[PDB]
Amino acid sequence: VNRCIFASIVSFDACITYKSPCSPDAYHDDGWFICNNHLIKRFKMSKMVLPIFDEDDNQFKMTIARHLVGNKERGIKRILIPSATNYQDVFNLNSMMQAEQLIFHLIYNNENAVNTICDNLKYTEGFTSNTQRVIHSVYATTKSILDTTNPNTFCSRVSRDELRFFDVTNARALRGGAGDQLFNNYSGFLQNLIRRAVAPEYLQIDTEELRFRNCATCIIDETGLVASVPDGPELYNPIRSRLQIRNVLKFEGDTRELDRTLSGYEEYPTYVPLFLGYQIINS
């Protein structure tokens, strides 16, 4: 059994085959439905796991993603996610295959274009072929994924009080706030996706309220989410894999054998986390 939405992706013709397929995790159950391959490919992110002490080494764990954006690029190039307000502006959908553009119109509820292209395809030979039933199978899949209640299961729980606020804790980080109001207006599938991705800064428990990083990684953004440090210069995001300058005015660095001397010491990884706001959980 396999679940990645990008493995559910199909191509209308043998050429333009949807090759370079999903990461094998597509056989897993994760509730991302994106394979990590596609998550890298489309949005410059890679998912990750917080190990939580279950009051113990006992299993408590939470999902995370690092972003893969660089330190120099700005605006749209920093954008992580769009709104329907701008999803076409970000994707340049025409470059994309027709089923991809279709599925984006699904996510952003562009029923107009959806039905337009559906009606155009009806009489095409390849849509008298069961491409219709394929696309509506994808539809049904999403329908199940939101049959789990899009508001009630996702957040409007009867344990309603166990809420995530993604608003910035800092009272001076005032560009946040109504970003949480936007969150309600993003489609619930995406709300759930965020609820996966984003580590809280804090959690209230009946045990205690507790604090996990000093300061927030980014902020909520007014179209879709962006590499959005609350203040100051963008933090150096390194990159792990044309007639331009690439000067790096390095220190001379003659202290050879450094690694053979020090390697036992903790080799601090750098990839940016996703602390944001306050979760609440009963007991």
Binding site: T148, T149, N150, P151, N152, T153, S159, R160
Partner: protein, 364 residues
């Protein structure tokens, strides 16, 4: 169990909201009026929607969540006439009572309240509400009602949800709260429920017991309800075989459509027989395999009635043992077999044939 002497229950669905007005200052004999008043509630949530100022009659008013202790447990509870006490829709037996006769105002008859002084002030609510489940949605915070006051008035399609920890009794409570207000509403709102429902069907059986408990004193209301699996699957299939202009069409549609022909054909539809056949209990009852619950069915002015098994004279046990018997010269094995062989030859059929004589009851 029973209600201890000097306690009385008022049931009314209207009591889903607190009927502040009705209560009066209790007094002991000797006119020892008791302005001290305590109320017990399932939750502080209840208290959040209760106004002290309603009760200027009293100078001393306090309210707390009920807790079912151990040590005071008795058929005869502790008494304390020094304060009036009320319990509001209590779930579980009470250990202490107030001044004079105590009274409780509740929507639901628990088993605890079986043999009790009781009043119901019931009235018929005609408008049966409905379920519908396609798999836009009204999302509900599926416990707090007034959160969605006016919402339930305005919209007619609502989602229903719970966190795991809920006690079965709490679930039952909140659900029962819903349906009263729905029957008060002017239109059949459609339930949608995010639960595998099997044990929920079981508590529906419990609702059946409860409603019969009501009926022991009740309105004999035309209350709509149904089995939720054995019915629904088969009904869906039946429509499927039929043309399905409206997959959403109410069962009662089909019901009354069939009803149109009963008297002219004077006989029971297979549909209605499968109903009262494929319920667990109110049926042939696979629980016990009791088709013996044949329907004797009568209509105005008839000299006769329609059984599950043909016409009958009135008020008699389905068939007299004395009879113009299916004498064995007819229905002799031998003749049965001979005719069957004729049949088999004529058909050129190898297998799958069986035969049986007809039989008769009071009437032939």
């Amino acid at each position: 169990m029973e209600c201890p002497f000097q306690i009385q229950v008022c049931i009314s669905d209207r009591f889903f909201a607190f009927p502040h007005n009705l209560v009066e200052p209790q007094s002991d004999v000797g006119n020892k009026l008791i302005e001290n008043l305590i109320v017990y509630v399932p939750t502080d949530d209840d208290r959040l929607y209760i106004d002290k100022k309603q009760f200027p009659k009293f100078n001393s008013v306090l309210v707390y969540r009920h807790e079912h202790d151990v040590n005071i447990d008795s058929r005869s509870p502790k008494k304390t006439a020094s304060a009036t006490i009320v319990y509001w829709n209590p779930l579980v037996p009470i250990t202490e009572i107030g001044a004079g006769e105590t009274r409780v105002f509740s929507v639901l008859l628990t088993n605890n309240l079986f043999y009790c002084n009781t009043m119901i002030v019931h009235h018929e609510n005609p408008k049966c509400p409905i379920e519908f489940t396609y798999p836009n949605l009204r999302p509900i915070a599926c416990e707090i009602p007034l959160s969605h006051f006016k919402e339930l008035v305005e919209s007619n399609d609502f989602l229903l949800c719970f966190n795991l920890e809920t006690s079965t009794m709490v679930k039952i409570l909140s659900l029962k709260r819903i349906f009263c207000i729905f029957q008060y509403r002017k239109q059949p709102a459609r339930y949608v429920i995010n639960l595998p429902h099997e044990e929920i069907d079981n508590l529906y059986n419990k609702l059946n017991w409860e409603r019969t408990r009501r009926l022991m004193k009740g309105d004999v209301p035309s209350n709509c309800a149904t089995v939720n699996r054995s019915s629904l699957k088969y009904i869906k299939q039946a429509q499927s075989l039929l043309g399905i202009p409206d997959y959403s069409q109410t069962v009662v549609d089909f019901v009354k459509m069939f009803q149109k022909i009963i008297f002219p054909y004077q006989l029971v539809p297979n549909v209605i027989i499968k109903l009262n056949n494929f319920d667990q209990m109110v049926s042939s009852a696979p629980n016990k395999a009791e088709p013996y619950k044949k329907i004797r069915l009568f209509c105005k002015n008839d000299s006769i009635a329609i059984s599950s098994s043909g016409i009958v004279p009135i008020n008699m046990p389905d068939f007299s043992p004395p009879n113009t018997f299916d004498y064995s010269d007819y229905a002799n094995r031998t003749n049965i077999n001979f005719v069957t062989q004729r049949v088999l030859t004529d058909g050129g059929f190898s297998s799958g044939i069986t035969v049986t004589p007809v039989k008769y009851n009071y009437y032939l």
